Amino acid sequence: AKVLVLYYSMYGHIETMARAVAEGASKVDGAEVVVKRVPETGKTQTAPVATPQELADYDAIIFGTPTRFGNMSGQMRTFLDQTGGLWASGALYGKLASVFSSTGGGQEQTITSTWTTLAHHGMVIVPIGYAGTPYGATTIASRQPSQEELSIARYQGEYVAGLAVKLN
Amino acid sequence: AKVLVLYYSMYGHIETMARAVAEGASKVDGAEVVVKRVPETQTAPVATPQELADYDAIIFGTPTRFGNMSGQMRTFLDQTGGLWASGALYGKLASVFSSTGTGGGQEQTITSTWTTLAHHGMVIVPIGYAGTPYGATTIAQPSQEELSIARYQGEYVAGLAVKLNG
Amino acid sequence: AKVLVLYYSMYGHIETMARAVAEGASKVDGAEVVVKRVPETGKTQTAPVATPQELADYDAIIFGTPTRFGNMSGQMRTFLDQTGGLWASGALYGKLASVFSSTGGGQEQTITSTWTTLAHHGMVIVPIGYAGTPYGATTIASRQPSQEELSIARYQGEYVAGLAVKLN
Amino acid sequence: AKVLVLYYSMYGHIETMARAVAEGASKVDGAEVVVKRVPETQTAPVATPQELADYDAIIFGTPTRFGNMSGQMRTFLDQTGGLWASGALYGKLASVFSSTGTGGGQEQTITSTWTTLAHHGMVIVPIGYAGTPYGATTIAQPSQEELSIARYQGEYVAGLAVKLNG
Ligand SMILES: [Cl-]
Ligand SMILES: [Cl-]
Ligand SMILES: [Cl-]
Ligand SMILES: [Cl-]
């Protein structure tokens, strides 16, 4: 029922993707969707900035990040480093997680490496399959996200939100 | 909810692990648990790729070969193209457990397995810290501790399968 | 000096890529380039079929495979499974390895997972960087490889062959 | 050939490993070996990202945090965008060694590091079977066996650097 779309955006492209994720999630009856960004560690930033413990308030979190050499961005990594207190209390255990990314190639490695990080919190991992990448929505970022990439982002939000409602 | 524990065992270590996973799953009210093994190239019946569509959750057990899953499990999964094209496993729960191999690689075996299951659109369930948080493992002679974690994994995934299905 | 381009091709697309790799390798003075395929485990197959121990005769091997769910193809995997005798004698130790792939997404995982397999043989791993993916040449396969994808394949052969000559 | 052993150490375990790698590298005729550490947030000087361009081979040492490299090494590598854009590390030799962390993950740390270095077009050198074939590791109190493997890794990579450069 409560779905957080949490992102870092350098150029606005992940932000555009995150708003498409959120639009998709909002199509689901019973899903309460909120959009936040992680602090800086350029396009003017838009969404409210999240604090680490806010994550515990959500049933699903959909994480959006540009790649940095096939890893999540330093900004999202630093934010997730500050979830040690959540880890020590089992706060995020069993909550749904899903990820979307943009280039800065490496998009697949960015997603799968993020999964491993979130598995340490015991989060349930939601890929999107054939419905690429199958691991999560991605974009190639001057070039803006295509309508096709945004449709896949919208799908991902909708799918994850439905799973959240089914579970909670 | 129907839970399949699907495994390949070379030395009996993964068989023992699979039985522990099934024991945990069988503790869950409303979970129907079956154990099968993949064909070669043990009491559990051998699975066909087609029957995987019948289950709400599948927990996959495999030995490690040079940092990835065993050839037997990989060959089996290689033959799920028809399932893939029809979306037969889409949205189903998946979880993985493994055995170490020469040069280690049990964590890698699990995360590599996740990649394959993500192509099928399966929902992936790690065990976290409630040894690796990715799934139950054995450094095999599985220890009582390792079996206790395998039991937890079955109970946890079967509970999730019942909560989302019945 | 001796460079093997070894592939499996289901639809001809990896074959097309492999011949571009080989063309690139052949541009290097002092590189002796040979193309072979792994046995079946459709377009009519062209290149001679390799046997596992032939790999020991080469200074560099450039491996081409379609993806199967983000792993190398069953055909290339089965072939590489039959290199246990090479492994036990240290036959492939220190030789150059590089990889290219095609979809069947998952292209990045196919390459990086192949690397881990070849690291068990102690092979030196050659990615291509920015010169995506940075991990190796790839194509999206009815659709044939684009001239851009083939140029990257050609680059990869040329680069690996030069490293082979520099080393041997 | 100039070889840099670049590391981050929390408890001294990776420092001891880095010194073993450097000892192995220093056995190689024509290899010039230097040890530096990445900045925080020990006798070895602290490295700047810019100076990595000066070396023929860089052997990276890091602890593991939740299945990936330490924040300190990752932050350092995060700041190699200028190097990346200019191709400063392209074609240079890279190798990795690591320490285990809570929930394991030392092999994953190495292969994740490989991915980052591949973006820079670095040539990646595993150690094979001459513990994981990906690079030297410690289950830390590094053992004499672990240090012997770290020495081998330095000697092997320095030999390769001399053969392709001088
Ligand atoms: Cl962006
Ligand atoms: Cl076994
Ligand atoms: Cl093909
Ligand atoms: Cl340390």
Side-chain angles (χ1 to χ4, degrees):
Chain A
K2 292 192 211 187
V3 180
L4 173 64
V5 182
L6 178 71
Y7 69 91
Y8 176 66
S9 186
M10 202 178 179
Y11 297 124
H13 306 127
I14 284 295
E15 192 207 334
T16 301
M17 294 279 290
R19 298 189 178 281
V21 169
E23 190 188 346
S26 296
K27 292 171 172 187
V28 176
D29 195 36
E32 172 172 354
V33 182
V34 329
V35 180
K36 303 203 176 311
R37 70 193 167 82
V38 307
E40 188 54 68
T41 284
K43 205 148 169 290
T44 131
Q45 304 279 355
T46 59
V49 4
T51 63
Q53 285 203 55
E54 287 189 77
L55 305 208
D57 297 342
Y58 293 91
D59 298 301
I61 302 161
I62 309 174
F63 297 83
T65 180
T67 180
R68 195 73 199 201
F69 312 125
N71 200 61
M72 67 178 82
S73 65
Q75 296 93 161
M76 175 68 69
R77 176 177 54 79
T78 300
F79 185 82
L80 291 171
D81 286 359
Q82 299 163 239
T83 63
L86 298 183
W87 185 81
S89 67
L92 296 192
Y93 198 91
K95 292 178 185 299
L96 300 172
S98 199
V99 359
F100 59 105
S101 66
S102 62
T103 50
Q107 52 180 25
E108 287 179 17
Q109 302 298 324
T110 297
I111 294 170
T112 60
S113 64
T114 302
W115 288 350
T116 64
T117 302
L118 298 177
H120 283 260
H121 280 274
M123 297 187 86
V124 173
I125 294 161
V126 184
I128 59 174
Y130 72 166
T133 80
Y135 314 127
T138 59
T139 177
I140 304 162
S142 45
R143 181 201 176 265
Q144 288 161 334
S146 62
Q147 291 314 301
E148 296 68 36
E149 293 161 339
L150 291 175
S151 289
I152 292 155
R154 222 172 273 114
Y155 171 81
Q156 185 167 7
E158 195 177 353
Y159 175 46
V160 173
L163 238 28
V165 172
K166 220 177 159 190
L167 231 22
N168 302 277
Chain B
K2 301 176 207 171
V3 184
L4 173 64
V5 181
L6 178 69
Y7 76 91
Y8 178 72
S9 185
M10 286 197 283
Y11 306 119
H13 310 307
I14 292 298
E15 179 185 50
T16 298
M17 291 285 282
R19 286 170 170 168
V21 172
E23 163 59 17
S26 84
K27 299 188 208 280
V28 172
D29 288 354
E32 170 174 351
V33 189
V34 325
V35 175
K36 296 196 177 188
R37 62 192 174 91
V38 302
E40 187 48 64
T41 281
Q42 296 163 227
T43 62
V46 356
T48 61
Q50 17 294 139
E51 69 181 290
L52 305 202
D54 297 336
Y55 292 91
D56 301 301
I58 307 169
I59 313 176
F60 299 82
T62 180
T64 296
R65 169 94 145 284
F66 302 100
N68 211 319
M69 74 177 70
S70 71
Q72 292 79 181
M73 182 63 73
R74 179 56 78 182
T75 296
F76 189 84
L77 296 175
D78 280 354
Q79 295 171 346
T80 62
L83 293 186
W84 179 84
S86 73
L89 309 179
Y90 197 93
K92 295 182 180 308
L93 295 177
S95 198
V96 189
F97 61 102
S98 64
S99 266
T100 185
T102 186
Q106 73 269 188
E107 296 168 45
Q108 207 143 244
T109 293
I110 293 166
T111 61
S112 281
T113 303
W114 289 354
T115 293
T116 301
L117 301 178
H119 283 255
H120 278 275
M122 300 188 84
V123 172
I124 288 149
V125 354
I127 57 167
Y129 294 80
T132 171
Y134 309 144
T137 59
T138 183
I139 193 193
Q141 50 175 72
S143 69
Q144 289 302 302
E145 184 146 39
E146 294 171 334
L147 293 178
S148 174
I149 291 160
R151 290 194 293 275
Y152 171 80
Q153 181 168 13
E155 182 175 0
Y156 174 50
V157 345
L160 191 50
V162 169
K163 193 167 192 204
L164 62 139
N165 300 281
Chain C
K2 292 192 211 187
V3 180
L4 173 64
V5 182
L6 178 71
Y7 69 91
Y8 176 66
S9 186
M10 202 178 179
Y11 297 124
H13 306 127
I14 284 295
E15 192 207 334
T16 301
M17 294 279 290
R19 298 189 178 281
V21 169
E23 190 188 346
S26 296
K27 292 171 172 187
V28 176
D29 195 36
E32 172 172 354
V33 182
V34 329
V35 180
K36 303 203 176 311
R37 70 193 167 82
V38 307
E40 188 54 68
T41 284
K43 205 148 169 290
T44 131
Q45 304 279 355
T46 59
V49 4
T51 63
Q53 285 203 55
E54 287 189 77
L55 305 208
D57 297 342
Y58 293 91
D59 298 301
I61 302 161
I62 309 174
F63 297 83
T65 180
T67 180
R68 195 73 199 201
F69 312 125
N71 200 61
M72 67 178 82
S73 65
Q75 296 93 161
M76 175 68 69
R77 176 177 54 79
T78 300
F79 185 82
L80 291 171
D81 286 359
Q82 299 163 239
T83 63
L86 298 183
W87 185 81
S89 67
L92 296 192
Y93 198 91
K95 292 178 185 299
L96 300 172
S98 199
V99 359
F100 59 105
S101 66
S102 62
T103 50
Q107 52 180 25
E108 287 179 17
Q109 302 298 324
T110 297
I111 294 170
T112 60
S113 64
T114 302
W115 288 350
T116 64
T117 302
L118 298 177
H120 283 260
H121 280 274
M123 297 187 86
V124 173
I125 294 161
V126 184
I128 59 174
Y130 72 166
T133 80
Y135 314 127
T138 59
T139 177
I140 304 162
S142 45
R143 181 201 176 265
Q144 288 161 334
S146 62
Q147 291 314 301
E148 296 68 36
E149 293 161 339
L150 291 175
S151 289
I152 292 155
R154 222 172 273 114
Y155 171 81
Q156 185 167 7
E158 195 177 353
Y159 175 46
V160 173
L163 238 28
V165 172
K166 220 177 159 190
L167 231 22
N168 302 277
Chain D
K2 301 176 207 171
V3 184
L4 173 64
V5 181
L6 178 69
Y7 76 91
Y8 178 72
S9 185
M10 286 197 283
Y11 306 119
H13 310 307
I14 292 298
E15 179 185 50
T16 298
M17 291 285 282
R19 286 170 170 168
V21 172
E23 163 59 17
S26 84
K27 299 188 208 280
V28 172
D29 288 354
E32 170 174 351
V33 189
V34 325
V35 175
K36 296 196 177 188
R37 62 192 174 91
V38 302
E40 187 48 64
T41 281
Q42 296 163 227
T43 62
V46 356
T48 61
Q50 17 294 139
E51 69 181 290
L52 305 202
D54 297 336
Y55 292 91
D56 301 301
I58 307 169
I59 313 176
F60 299 82
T62 180
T64 296
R65 169 94 145 284
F66 302 100
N68 211 319
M69 74 177 70
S70 71
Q72 292 79 181
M73 182 63 73
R74 179 56 78 182
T75 296
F76 189 84
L77 296 175
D78 280 354
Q79 295 171 346
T80 62
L83 293 186
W84 179 84
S86 73
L89 309 179
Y90 197 93
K92 295 182 180 308
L93 295 177
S95 198
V96 189
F97 61 102
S98 64
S99 266
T100 185
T102 186
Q106 73 269 188
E107 296 168 45
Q108 207 143 244
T109 293
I110 293 166
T111 61
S112 281
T113 303
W114 289 354
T115 293
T116 301
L117 301 178
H119 283 255
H120 278 275
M122 300 188 84
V123 172
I124 288 149
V125 354
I127 57 167
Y129 294 80
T132 171
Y134 309 144
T137 59
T138 183
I139 193 193
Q141 50 175 72
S143 69
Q144 289 302 302
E145 184 146 39
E146 294 171 334
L147 293 178
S148 174
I149 291 160
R151 290 194 293 275
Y152 171 80
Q153 181 168 13
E155 182 175 0
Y156 174 50
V157 345
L160 191 50
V162 169
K163 193 167 192 204
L164 62 139
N165 300 281

